[PDB]
Design a protein around this nucleic acid. Sequence first.
DNA 1: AACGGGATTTCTTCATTTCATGCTAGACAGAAGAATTCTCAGTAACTTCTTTGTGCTGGTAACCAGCACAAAGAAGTTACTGAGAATTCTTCTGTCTAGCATGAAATGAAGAAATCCCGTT
DNA 2: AACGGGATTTCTTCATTTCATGCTAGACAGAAGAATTCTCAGTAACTTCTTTGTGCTGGTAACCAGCACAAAGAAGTTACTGAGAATTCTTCTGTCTAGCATGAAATGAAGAAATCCCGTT
Lengths: 100, 97, 79, 78, 90, 90, 83, 89
Amino acid sequence: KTRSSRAGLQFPVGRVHRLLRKGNYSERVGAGAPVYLAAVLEYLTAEILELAGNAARDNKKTRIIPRHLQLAIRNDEELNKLLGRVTIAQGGVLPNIQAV
Amino acid sequence: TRSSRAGLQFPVGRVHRLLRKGNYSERVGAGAPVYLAAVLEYLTAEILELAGNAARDNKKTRIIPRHLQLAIRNDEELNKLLGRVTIAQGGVLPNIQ
Amino acid sequence: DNIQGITKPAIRRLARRGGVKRISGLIYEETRGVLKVFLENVIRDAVTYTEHAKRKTVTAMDVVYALKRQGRTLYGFGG
Amino acid sequence: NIQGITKPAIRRLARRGGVKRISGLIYEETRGVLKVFLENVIRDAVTYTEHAKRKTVTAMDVVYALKRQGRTLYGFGG
Amino acid sequence: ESYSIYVYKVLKQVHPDTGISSKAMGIMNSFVNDIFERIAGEASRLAHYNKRSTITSREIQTAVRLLLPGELAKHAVSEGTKAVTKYTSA
Amino acid sequence: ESYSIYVYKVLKQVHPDTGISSKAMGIMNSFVNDIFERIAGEASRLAHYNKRSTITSREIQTAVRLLLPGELAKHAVSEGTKAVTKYTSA
Amino acid sequence: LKEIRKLQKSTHLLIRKLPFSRLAREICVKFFNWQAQALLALQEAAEAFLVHLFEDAYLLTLHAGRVTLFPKDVQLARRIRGL
Amino acid sequence: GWLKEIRKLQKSTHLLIRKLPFSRLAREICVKFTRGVDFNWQAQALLALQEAAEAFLVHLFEDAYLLTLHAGRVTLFPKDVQLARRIRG
DNA sequence: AACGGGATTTCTTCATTTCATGCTAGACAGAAGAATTCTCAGTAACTTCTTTGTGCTGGTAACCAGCACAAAGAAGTTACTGAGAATTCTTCTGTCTAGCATGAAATGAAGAAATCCCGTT
DNA sequence: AACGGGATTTCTTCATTTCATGCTAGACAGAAGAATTCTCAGTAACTTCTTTGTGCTGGTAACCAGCACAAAGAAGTTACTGAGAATTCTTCTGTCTAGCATGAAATGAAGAAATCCCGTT
């Protein structure tokens, strides 16, 4: 009877909802807002883990570590934009140099 | 008025609402909206203080946005605060590096 | 092609007012270039707002919220 | 104390970023900078910590503070 | 508490043969809240400009629409305006 | 309803001789607002972080320290610190 | 280097309106009615952008020694801002 | 150590500035904003500090080494790591 | 390629979430007065134009005044590893306060009028 | 210098505070848990700190090679009003359509050790 499996989501519809009434982002929350939102985070969360997992394979590795999330981000048109002023920990950097 | 007890001039009354209505919380202290009203008054009187000195400085008796733009860029403490801002019709600090 | 509404003499005023002396040659397109990734970038984030409450009238406030979302607060238009 | 940061240290950094010839004074233009930083960053992150009336600054006490300077640190959510 | 466990099952979704560490888990976990915080925010800033005192599924939409860029945006929409339906009719 | 009835009140308080253009009044109010927010803003956020549903004066003070620079801080705080007691002892 | 101390001292929006006005509705039509007031706000903020843009960019021209702008600059500049 | 070492550290991911000299460093600059007191620093809250402080000098270096290579050079200078700290805000 | 010490899995609980209905309510779809936004036309008329030139500036070498990377060395400084103390975040449990409700007037305010006047013409 | 368009002022009805009085809640004040973080001690283990040696980078003064500012006599086309023409924000109404409110029962998610297991030594 979980509201999450009812919306086909993995990410908590319940929790988010509540997380949405506490921080007082308003007085009333729709019955669909906390199932639409929670679904957007699932995608994004699956959107990185998608790539960050890949690079892991390209890096001859099957274990998501901070470094893999770094390249997953800095090697994607959309993400980098989004994660502008973000700084991944144990991230490292893109191997780009340039001469004269 | 409540701004009377607090002895202000900026609506201790209005803020309180404008503060419980913005959902910044669900329970607002009683000293808070009184405090913020005084902190707002200061800063506002503050900047004017400069806008209007350089206004009489620059030989003019009426404050125009330009004067607000000058009190700003001419207050080490104000420019810091007003970093991500821009005044409508305000030229710049006549400066040729 | 209305990207030419901005001109050599005009771009030179902003260039000049910005403490710029001897301008270069292509700075009369560069301008016409970035002014279009700014206005463009500020328009979208500002249109959606007009497109949210509902209407076909974009107010200075649909804009201003676009400039804050931008990271560039603007003064003198509120309500 | 500031000399806590060595030479190859600041270099390594300067190196990671893709720098060839690391000039002179540079070494102190880092101790200098890193000083302005940890400052604005610790004074912030400490005010929040004196709010909860704590004698221990919290991981989150810092993060909130970067999130004020304009730097969203990730890997530490308490 | 935290999204950790959820960030895991999903991980297995789009990648089974693959694993994760713990620091790289900290980041995920730091990622979720980072986007939550922006969406519910600008969506909160939204239901406000329009006197509405309630956040619709439409607020969060036009809200994502404004926070996620070109291509990232489009897909968060179809995963949303398709997550409300399979929630309502079923 | 806007603060330009209060901004002006303070205007001719400090320079009762001077006036102001309605265009600077736009900057004025736009400003006061931009300031009301940033402070009540990171206050909602400060009462939020330290698990409470209350915004004391104590909050709207560490809230200022954290937003107002240098001596613009060490003055606005004793401008409130002073404006609150005088209230209590109404 | 004549006009420098003329326009710094002024505030009038340099770029004309109309040219600009269409320039906007055009990037707009890519997605109405614009309170004539709002077109100024999308203006005052527009020029304000360019101004502090070359300015901040000239230090890039007066660092390589140069005294003549170059697009070579409004690309290193817009590059250290992340815009 | 040029085109050879300036591609080993990019490949690296760890810290570059020694932990303790930095640890000591934070606790002291901490001593100011407290009337002159001690203050426990979550061993946790300390690493965080650095992680960011690092990527701040690195990015701030490369974000400037493009200012050196502008005046047609290859030697970073205190001339560059201050132009940008004025071309950022 | 042999291992060091994290992930990955189970297996049990304290809460948190889903339930069930009755309600105040924010919300919404049908009216409508009217502020304006868009425009056409004008008489103004400022601006942007187009250009022929030469001045003042940028692009390359040239030849070079010193700076910074490479070492082979010298031995002090980073790591932590505990472990004790304890310096302290963290909880706890209901009095003592303290702020939210709900109203009923009672004023502080936004919005037109009209004289009164500063600073672009 | 001078008068034209923007306040300054004074007036009025109108919406938003305000004080009454409970009613919940929220802050609180030490009593001690359970944490972990300071404390030193004390070693081990590199990583720093040199001290030339000097390659070649940054200059600085020259020259060459153009790119950019400059009125000018104009007419393009941007201002500025004005009056509409009327498209549309906004305010209302009245009733929908709906999330809020519990009161607890139950299913879920955070936690405490323990066999397996992946990069790293």
